[PDB]
Amino acid sequence: ADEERAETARLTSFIGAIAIGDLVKSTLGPKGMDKILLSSGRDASLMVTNDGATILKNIGVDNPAAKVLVDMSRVQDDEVGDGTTSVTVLAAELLREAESLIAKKIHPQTIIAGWREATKAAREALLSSAVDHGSDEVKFRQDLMNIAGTTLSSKLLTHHKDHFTKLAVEAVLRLKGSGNLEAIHIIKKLGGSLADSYLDEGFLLDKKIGVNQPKRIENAKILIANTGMDTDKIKIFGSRVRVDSTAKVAEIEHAEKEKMKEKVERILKHGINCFINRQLIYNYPEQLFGAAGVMAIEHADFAGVERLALVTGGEIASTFDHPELVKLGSCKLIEEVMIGEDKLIHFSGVALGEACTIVLRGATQQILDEAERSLHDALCVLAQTVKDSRTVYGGGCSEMLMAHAVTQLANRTPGKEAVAMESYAKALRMLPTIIADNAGYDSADLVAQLRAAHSEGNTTAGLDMREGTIGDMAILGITESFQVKRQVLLSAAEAAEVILRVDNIIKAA
Amino acid sequence: KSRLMGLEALKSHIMAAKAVANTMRTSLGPNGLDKMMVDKDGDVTVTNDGATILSMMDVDHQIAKLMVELSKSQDDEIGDGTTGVVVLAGALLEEAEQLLDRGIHPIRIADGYEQAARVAIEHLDKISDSVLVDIKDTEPLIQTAKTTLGSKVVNSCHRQMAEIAVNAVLTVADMERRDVDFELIKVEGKVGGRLEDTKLIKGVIVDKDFSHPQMPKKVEDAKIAILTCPFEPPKPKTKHKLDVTSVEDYKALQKYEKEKFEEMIQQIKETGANLAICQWGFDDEANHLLLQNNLPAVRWVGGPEIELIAIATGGRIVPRFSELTAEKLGFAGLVQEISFGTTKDKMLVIEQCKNSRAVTIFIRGGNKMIIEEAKRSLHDALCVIRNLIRDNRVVYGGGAAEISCALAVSQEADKCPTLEQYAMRAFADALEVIPMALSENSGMNPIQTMTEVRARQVKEMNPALGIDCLHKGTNDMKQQHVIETLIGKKQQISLATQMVRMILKIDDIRKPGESEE
Amino acid sequence: DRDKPAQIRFSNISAAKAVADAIRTSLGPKGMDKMIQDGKGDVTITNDGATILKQMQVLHPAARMLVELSKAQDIEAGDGTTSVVIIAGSLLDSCTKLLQKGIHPTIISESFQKALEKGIEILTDMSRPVELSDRETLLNSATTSLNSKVVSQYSSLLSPMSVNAVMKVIDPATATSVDLRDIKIVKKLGGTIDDCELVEGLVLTQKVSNSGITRVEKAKIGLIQFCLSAPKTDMDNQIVVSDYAQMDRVLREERAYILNLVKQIKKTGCNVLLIQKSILRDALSDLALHFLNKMKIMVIKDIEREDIEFICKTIGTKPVAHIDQFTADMLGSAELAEEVNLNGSGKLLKITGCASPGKTVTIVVRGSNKLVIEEAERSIHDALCVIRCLVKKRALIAGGGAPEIELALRLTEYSRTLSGMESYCVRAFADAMEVIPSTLAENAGLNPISTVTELRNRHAQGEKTAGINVRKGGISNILEELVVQPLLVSVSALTLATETVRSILKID
Amino acid sequence: RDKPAQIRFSNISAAKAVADAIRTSLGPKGMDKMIQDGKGDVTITNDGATILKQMQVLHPAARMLVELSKAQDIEAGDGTTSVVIIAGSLLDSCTKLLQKGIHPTIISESFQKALEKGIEILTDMSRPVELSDRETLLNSATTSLNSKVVSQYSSLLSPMSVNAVMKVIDPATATSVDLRDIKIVKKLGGTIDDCELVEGLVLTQKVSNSGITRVEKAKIGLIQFCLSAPKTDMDNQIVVSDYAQMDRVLREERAYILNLVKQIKKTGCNVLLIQKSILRDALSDLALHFLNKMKIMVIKDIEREDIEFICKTIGTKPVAHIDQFTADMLGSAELAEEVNLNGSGKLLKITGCASPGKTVTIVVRGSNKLVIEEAERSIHDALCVIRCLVKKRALIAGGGAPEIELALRLTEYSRTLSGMESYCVRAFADAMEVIPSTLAENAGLNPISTVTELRNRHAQGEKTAGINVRKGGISNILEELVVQPLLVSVSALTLATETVRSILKIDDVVNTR
């Protein structure tokens, strides 16, 4: 096999991680500038992104350390709901930081152990940088709005974000029980502009059964159901169907009709005003449902079927293990409505008011699918910002706080740790550099200013990267939810060390 | 045809044990920087006990080719110090060549190394104590079962995992009259739980087989009734069905199912338990009709799986539907359906108190690699207690036993003299390597660290103290509670000079032009 | 560490500037047309960049971006085509310097992107409103804007066709954007430029009906998006091959279906059936199709589904993939549906009038030959586009880059007053402008330098006391002979370029 | 930088390469060399002891070994190789420690540790000798003279070696009694048995003829003037454009000096040491005849050391010009003697001279030069080996053997020290044993037999005993009739010890501007 030992593998641990840093840091922040995505399998085909996650794929990653961070990115991207491009260069900075120092002969043992509590040293400061915002609801409104445009900013929606910055928080504003991805119903449908993106307050079926079933039913008793009206699922009534003869087609047709008529009548025994079937509904039953004055929605969307059941407070048929036993949803209105260009069956009066159906209106799907995707990312933060309504001063400000904290802790701890911890505290101060370098402004100025600012202990004043000056962190919007940083501050302050442990690297390829 | 002579060979010989043992020297102790393995397909994984990474390494060299074999029995009986011997077997050679660099026979010093082992052995035999006992040994094992799982998978391990690890051993370790071997104890990995969560089982635990939950999902008794044959009409794990010619034959068809169940049940009922392990699978339909009948079966059981529950219970598998006895069924002090985690179906928990030929500790896990990393860690420590429970012998060292035996064996070479005066000196120099060369990987200085426990040998010998392999503030083997089985280090003494002699054995290097495969 | 991106950005902007430079000769009508042997080793002869840039192109991503940037101006305005290509490198001439000069790439972007709006805003000062409500004025101005350009040939006839087709689908006095969405451009081989004409319902591919009546008035417009056929083996007739009675009997299977499937077509009933091409079908049973039209439903088969898509919207015939989808709503309601084989050569079903949303227009483009048809199209496409731009832009602006020679002065002037790091940029921003009309002053032949320099003062005087007059190719009022264009092609070329130049600065 | 690191290695490269082949030591081993020199000069070379000093090396690191060679010899007179060859043993440990990663200062300081621990053991083993009694003086002379050129003439040279130091001997033991007081005067004529240890100041002064200052009340003077005459000191009014003008001034020159040499004869001083300082040329070539005419020994511009021997030993100072006669600061000699053995040879003996209990003078005599040589060098170390005893007494062994005894016993100190240096001293401790192996190394084929056993044997003979390279066989090495004074090796230890840490004290090499 091929063993990459420490130094070489460490330089190899560097090659990807450091160079992967180059782009994701270049894209770091809104004034973070894009990297061309060259598709080497598909033509040369060019793509332009402010996001590193998309970069991690198009040109694949050989470097294991960088290959590791692709997890960390996605991990942080998916879990934190943000910090995609951030946590990555964060591992690039310290490895870069550790380069000369492990090239200074300093053990990663020395290094890792140093950055270990250094990582924790930022925490208490971070835990101190925790700024409760959203504690009040008017806070929570602006608190959500604080981080509403924050996540979508580096998730590469620069246009309709504002329109969603207003939308996404509203759905999250009502929750207040917990940040909810289920009660909140996510719909994105073509028609209208992307600033025409809509919020249905209630459940929504983007399904439309049309007038084939009753379109308008008020105070509608819902049957949330998996119950097959053609396929005819279990608790089956009959003999196992068989064909023994040429003309046998008749009886199987007649045998299923009863089996269909049973679940019709059985679900007609719910008295439900609207039948919602996660499976389809055949001609014989649907003409029975339609003659029963019941709206029968066929093959309704699976999570929505539960979301319907949830938000309308009803129960799902449980695969017709409950013939009558499934509880019934009741919403004051079932109305097929045209929002944008398309008719969707809108359920308002659903039992959950915190529940909101955001109906995203595509001008095209290619932005619309990217819309909700990046839009769903703030929700993670927002949902966890519902749970922890808290903030941390962004723009590298909490950095400079945690910098001094560990920068003094370097001089407070000192030793083989402060060997590493200073290198650590530099990557703390390296974050304010990138966004300012992305913004093309003097970092050593804006850093050592913000240093002097946090040397005066001003974390309410920070690098404000819109204009890219040093300025207030008042929660101008430049402030971040406490969730993100503690999350983003973590995995790279881990993985970089974790990468420092692997030294002998045996590559059997 | 080529022949690479002597030093040429020796040069070739040394080209591995320098670096490939340094792979261990870089990995010595937890503070030893751990070994990533990227596969033939490019699959990255972190490794230690580098016989792992050496098997994961693909051998281009006979020493590399050999070392995996030399490393095996160490990782077999002891389970730990796999990093030590490879270093130590890789080290002394470096001293040994230096003596042929001095112009000394490999012949002579190896001999003087062979008994240098012996004189270190007795010297090693002094260290710690050669007896630990059930209440005593556990906590130092619970320390080891920790510090193995606390170094190598979790940081604190878990007093779940530590104790449950020693108890898995201690279970059969007591069964084997103060011995054990592994097969008697088997860690069963399944993820979706937590690393923390380890179900210590005296026998098989596998997922049960039901169809409808409305029909009973139940274990019967604590006893299992093991069947190769049907408890439910046997389907040779391939396509088999039921069919009817009429609506009435459909009615005739299902009572067949229920009566065959009853037929099978009534047999398997009266002969003990009711509870089936049935190799073959059955239709998911009449499976609930068997539940509806009563007393569930287990269908689609692995061919060997029925045998695993067979003999470990002390019984067998029922080979034929007509051939039936509790012996051909299972013997279990516990059989019960138990949900594995909250994430999936009930594992049927067979805890076999009527016999255990394998006491199988189940382990849950958060991730495969880390539940592996646990299982990785475990079998390492499983074998050290296995050394202990067999003959309870421990040694304070890795910061001590070397510099301990490094002291006297080199001291012995003073009273040795001639060909063995360099041997037992340079022998113990390889001992000088590891605890030093551990501190190498550490941020502490190995040369510096050596000098201390060196000065300690002037102070104190075979000490309960030593270097800190845990990279602590205290440098001990006791406040460290670091140790091995006095077996292990002695067992580790065996291997190093064993390859040293081994590269000597014949005079024949002559190759087709191929000395490597 | 950001070295390579600059190098890449160099490599980007270089090959960016590069491909945009070659057109700056072929820029304009006096721009010289290149006969180009290609990878095919065969000559290709064009003037406008887009065709040139597509017809021979290798792959450089920035170059690939510009052929889009080229296409952009096209797909945006259908107009000012050659222009957007010239401004990019002109801007990059400023940018690369400023980048060399050290102006941060994010800055230059937002520098010129801010400075963009200031340019087109002073353009709105330059802008001259013409009546978008008056068809005549549009007929007068757009054709004159077309007479500022090459083709009046069929245009001065087809602008009466173009301005009307637009005017007919023009709802507002503003006349708004009006994409050609409601203008159906179809040709007919025979006929004339005069037999080219606007028609008020959707002309359908030929008329493909076998027994289907040659004309059915008040047409339910059926659509067949599903097969007419019983299952296949070796034909619409399903043939199991051994002995010929089975394949004779499976007909009873096959024959009845294609009859009933048709009987089902006439159940709900259709006066016209839209049927797309049979290769836009898996296949269509003639057995059905015979008995189909033999139940007397007039049909068009062999029609493009995108025609159908055009037809599904403009006359509102909702897509029918199925017989449940046979319904008076999904079966479009035509006022009249006929076929005309005549008034020239070729056959087409003429829907003349219909139930239609958004008005509707089809123009059936005819001529003594295909070329007379072809340039007629090329006569309208400009007219089609220049109107929909001129109506998209309330005012009009004279052409020849003289507004830029105005504006290059204007912004550089304010770029002083702007100050900021971008003063150097926003001047150089505007400074990029005059190079383009210079290149025209070179492309028409003149001193590109002497003149446009002087025009900046000419455009410092009356702002037009002079301009770049293409037939004169020199210092002249471009209002004395109108060299004039809708505001968009100016805005279009600009708004595109900066963005295309913007991200590249932000591109690593 | 890399240059600092490589140059110490490059020092260890050139230096250590030299100090090793510097052991064939003793033995009839290795084929004789006709050395074409660095300039192309063919030179037949043998007997590494002189081949040490003989060696022409370049580079700083190689020449410090010649500097090292020069150091031991002048110190003891014995063990010329002993100080250098161990620089091979030193730079053994050095690199391995630099290969161990040990710091140069630690490797430097490691030199002092083993040194202290070494001078410990060498004295521990060494058996004390009396440097007053004639006995070990004879014996240390014996074995040294047994290792010197003449074993046969070691006999009479021994009392002439023993009495020489015992002339200059100082109370009990001390480091004193140098060889500068000893004036070795080669006397052509006679034999080695005729070599004569004289108690007093003897000069190598060789003047005209004989009977010249053989008389009694012949003082030996120093004159920092010379005699006068017209055309010597006093003026000439006549100038020479003419050979006749040349004659009358030389005649007047001769006639006046003839009166002055009387005044030297009546001085009681029959040897003036005439200043090499030249007044006109000072003492005339016309004058030398006249001073010798009075039986006064002066040769033109007398050899300067004789001037200082008469200053140092006798206490003579210049006097007033012979025109004034003499202030008679000319030291007290009632006999100065020109001795012709076999009627030949020029030797000025000052008998009755003032001597300060020292300046014993061996007159090394012979009819040949080789005869004088074989005597002169042999008695020299016999003078030295006794001077060695006086300086530092007892005896260790010789030929490197007792160092292996130090080597065994030092590894025990290397066992005790428990430092990095305990290993560093240890890395050096057994590096000492290379000497007898490399002493026996250079003679031949089928090599490996005795070498490791040249070490192993001693450790088998343990801590007291080992192999004696001169007589062969294992015993207590310090007396096989194989000895050098305890001074010689402890003198050998520190020097190479010193010089090597300088290489470590080197940060990087340089070249002057």
Chains near A, with 3+ CB pairs < 8 A?
B, C
Q: According to the annotation, is A330 in a ligand binding site?
A: no
DSSP conformation class of B182: G
- Strand order in A329-339's β-sheet? A203-205, A342-348, A329-339, A216-225, A274-277, A295-297
Phi, psi of B336 (to 5 degrees): -150, 140
Which residue in the block uniquely carries the two structure tokens 């080197």? D506
Contacts of A437 in chain C (CB under 8 A): 2
End-to-end CA distance of chain A: 7
* Number of continuous H segments (helices) and E segments (strands) in chain D: 16, 12
Contacts of B150 (CB under 8 A, 6+ apart): B156, B157, B162
Residue B107 near chain D (CB below 8 Å): no
Maximum C-alpha span of chain B: 100
Instruction: Report the C-alpha gap between A243 and A252 in whole angstroms.
Output: 8
DSSP notation for C333-346: EES-EEEE--SSSS
Contact B190, B201 (CB under 8 A): no
Task: Work out whether strand D360-366 and strand D348-351 pair parallel, antiparallel, or are unpaired.
Answer: unpaired
Residue B289 C-alpha from the chain's centroid: 43
Instruction: Report the C-alpha gap between A331 and A312 in whole angstroms.
Output: 6
Task: Work out whether strand C361-365 and strand C183-187 pair parallel, antiparallel, or are unpaired.
Answer: parallel
Tokens of B385: 């207690």
Instruction: Report the C-alpha gap between A146 and A478 in whole angstroms.
Output: 8
End-to-end CA distance of chain C: 11
Task: Tell me the C-alpha to C-alpha distance, in Å, between residue D116 and each of D120, D432, D490, D493.
Answer: 6, 15, 10, 10
Q: Residue length, chain C?
A: 508
Cα angle: D140, vertex D144, D148; to 5 degrees: 155
The partner residue sitting opposite A108, judged by closest CB among B33, B37, B41, is B33
Contact A435, A465 (CB under 8 A): yes
Instruction: Report the C-alpha gap between D404 and D413 in whole angstroms.
Output: 14
Contacts of B213 (CB under 8 A, 6+ apart): none
Chains near D, with 3+ CB pairs < 8 A?
B
Q: For B144, left (φ over 0), alpha (ψ -120 to 50), or beta?
A: alpha
| Among candidate residues B370, B344, B315, B328, the one with its CA nearest the CA of residue B204 | B315
Residue A248 C-alpha from the chain's centroid: 54
Chains near B, with 3+ CB pairs < 8 A?
A, D
Task: Tell me the C-alpha to C-alpha distance, in Å, between residue B285 and each of B228, B292, B515.
Answer: 21, 11, 62
Contacts of A39 in chain C (CB under 8 A): none
Please list the residues that pair with A131 across neighbouring strands.
A391
Tokens of D128: 């004390």
Contacts of C14 (CB under 8 A, 6+ apart): none
How many Cα atoms within 13 Å fall on the side-chain side of residue D312? 18
Which residue in the block uniquely carries the two structure tokens 């072809």? C374
**Closest approach of A233 to chain C, Cα-based (Å):** 26
**Closest approach of B497 to chain D, Cα-based (Å):** 22
The per-residue b/e assignment along A146-161, b for 16 or more CB within 10 angstroms, e otherwise, is bbbbbbbbbbbbeebb
Q: Which residue of A has its CA nearest to B212?
A: A321
Task: Work out whether strand C298-303 and strand C474-476 pair parallel, antiparallel, or are unpaired.
Answer: unpaired
DSSP conformation class of D187: E
Task: Tell me the C-alpha to C-alpha distance, in Å, between residue D343 and each of D346, D373, D472.
Answer: 10, 21, 47
| Among candidate residues A347, A356, A353, the one with its CA nearest the CA of residue A197 | A356
Instruction: Report the C-alpha gap between A35 and A45 in whole angstroms.
Output: 13
Tokens of D365: 């005599």
Please list the residues that pair with B318 across neighbouring strands.
B227
Residue ranges of alpha helices (H) inside C148-242 are: 155-169
Phi, psi of B303 (to 5 degrees): -50, -55
| Among candidate residues B62, B44, B64, B63, the one with its CA nearest the CA of residue B54 | B64
Contacts of B3 (CB under 8 A, 6+ apart): B509, B510, B511
D47 is catalytic: yes
Helix/strand/coil (H, E, C) string of B419-476? HHHHHHHHHHHHHHHHHHHHHHHCCCCHHHHHHHHHHHHHHCCCCCCCCCCCCCCCCC
Helix/strand/coil (H, E, C) string of C476-492? ECCCCCCCEEEHHHHHH
DSSP notation for A50-64: S-STTHHHHS----H
Instruction: Report the C-alpha gap between C16 and C60 in whole angstroms.
Output: 8
Instruction: Report the C-alpha gap between D435 and C388 in whole angstroms.
Output: 106
Rounded (10°) angle between helices D104-125 and D401-416: 120
DSSP notation for D380-404: HHHHHHHHHHHHS-S-B-STTHHHH
Helix/strand/coil (H, E, C) string of B306-322? HHHHHHHCCCCCECCCC
Task: Tell me the C-alpha to C-alpha distance, in Å, between residue B1 and each of A144, B88, B503, B508, B516.
Answer: 78, 34, 21, 14, 13
Instruction: Report the C-alpha gap between C25 and C440 in whole angstroms.
Output: 8
Contact A26 C2 (CB under 8 A): yes
Rounded (10°) angle between helices D60-76 and D369-391: 80
The partner residue sitting opposite D453, judged by closest CB among B418, B450, B457, is B418
Q: According to the annotation, is B181 in a ligand binding site?
A: no
Structure's resolution in angstroms: 8.5
Helix (H) or strand (E) holding C498: helix C487-506
Task: Work out whether strand B225-227 and strand B276-278 pair parallel, antiparallel, or are unpaired.
Answer: parallel
Q: According to the annotation, is B82 in a ligand binding site?
A: yes
The partner residue sitting opposite B441, judged by closest CB among A67, A109, A240, is A109
**Closest approach of B38 to chain A, Cα-based (Å):** 4
Instruction: Report the C-alpha gap between A232 and D108 in whole angstroms.
Output: 94
DSSP conformation class of D314: I
Helix/strand/coil (H, E, C) string of B321-390? CCCCCCCCCCCCCEEEEEECCCCCCEEEEEECCCCCCCECEEECCCCHHHHHHHHHHHHHHHHHHHHHHH
Interface of A with B in 236-255 (CB under 8 A): 239-240, 242, 244
Instruction: Report the C-alpha gap between B33 and A497 in whole angstroms.
Output: 11
End-to-end CA distance of chain B: 15
DSSP notation for B62-106: HHHHHHHHHHHHIIIII-S-HHHHHHHHHHHHHHHHHHHHTT--H
Examine chains D and B and say if they touch (3+ CB pairs below 8 A). Answer: yes
| CA dihedral sign of residues B18, B19, B20, B24 | positive
A85 is catalytic: yes
Calculated CA dihedral for residues D1, D2, D3, D9, nearest 10 degrees: 130
Contacts of B31 in chain A (CB under 8 A): 109
Tokens of A299: 């093959």
Contact B421 D456 (CB under 8 A): yes
Helix (H) or strand (E) holding C350: strand C348-351
- Strand order in D201-203's β-sheet? D201-203, D348-351, D335-338
Contacts of A143 (CB under 8 A, 6+ apart): A133, A134, A385, A389, A391, A475, A481
Contacts of A163 (CB under 8 A, 6+ apart): A194, A195, A197
Burial label for D164, CB within 10 Å (0-12, 13-18, 19+), is buried
The per-residue b/e assignment along A89-123, b for 16 or more CB within 10 angstroms, e otherwise, is bbbbbbbbbbbebbeeebbbbbbbbbbbbbbebbb
Q: Which amino acid is at B334?
A: L
Q: According to the annotation, is C147 in a ligand binding site?
A: yes
Contact B110, B515 (CB under 8 A): no
How many Cα atoms within 13 Å fall on the side-chain side of residue D12? 22
DSSP conformation class of D127: P
Phi, psi of A206 (to 5 degrees): -65, -10
Contacts of D244 (CB under 8 A, 6+ apart): none
Task: Tell me the C-alpha to C-alpha distance, in Å, between residue B252 and each of A7, A431, B258.
Answer: 76, 77, 10
Which residue in the block uniquely carries the two structure tokens 């420690």? D97
Burial label for B465, CB within 10 Å (0-12, 13-18, 19+), is buried
- Strand order in C128-129's β-sheet? C128-129, C395-398, C484-486
Residue B34 near chain A (CB below 8 Å): yes
Rounded (10°) angle between helices D486-505 and D60-76: 160
Examine chains A and C and say if they touch (3+ CB pairs below 8 A). Answer: yes
Tokens of B396: 């304070």
Q: How was this structure determined?
A: cryo-EM
| Among candidate residues B207, B396, B199, B186, the one with its CA nearest the CA of residue B298 | B207
| Among candidate residues B348, B214, B221, B216, the one with its CA nearest the CA of residue B294 | B216
The partner residue sitting opposite A506, judged by closest CB among B33, B35, B251, is B35
Contact A194, A285 (CB under 8 A): no
* Helix (H/G/I), strand (E/B), else coil: C204: strand
End-to-end CA distance of chain D: 21
- Provide the annotated active-site residues of C: 48, 81-82, 382
Instruction: Report the C-alpha gap between B40 and B48 in whole angstroms.
Output: 18
Which residue in the block uniquely carries the two structure tokens 């350390």? A65
Examine chains B and C and say if they touch (3+ CB pairs below 8 A). Answer: no
Helix (H) or strand (E) holding D42: strand D42-45
Burial label for D343, CB within 10 Å (0-12, 13-18, 19+), is exposed
Contacts of A27 in chain C (CB under 8 A): 508
Quote helix, strand, coil % in chain B, to nearest 5.
50, 10, 40
Phi, psi of A70 (to 5 degrees): -60, -40
How many Cα atoms within 13 Å fall on the side-chain side of residue B134? 9
Q: According to the annotation, is C467 in a ligand binding site?
A: no
Interface of A with B in 452-491 (CB under 8 A): none
Task: Tell me the C-alpha to C-alpha distance, in Å, between residue D50 and each of A307, D45, D53, D55, D78.
Answer: 105, 9, 5, 8, 12
Instruction: Report the C-alpha gap between C370 and A333 in whole angstroms.
Output: 60
Task: Tell me the C-alpha to C-alpha distance, in Å, between residue D248 and each of D242, D252, D261, D288.
Answer: 10, 6, 20, 19
Contact D137, D161 (CB under 8 A): yes
- Strand order in A198-200's β-sheet? A185-190, A357-362, A198-200
Contacts of B423 in chain D (CB under 8 A): none
Contact B422 D453 (CB under 8 A): no
* Number of continuous H segments (helices) and E segments (strands) in chain A: 15, 17
Helix (H) or strand (E) holding C42: none
For A44-184, strand residue ranges (E) read 46-49
Q: Residue length, chain A?
A: 509
State the CB neighbour count (10 A cutoff) for residue B296. 27
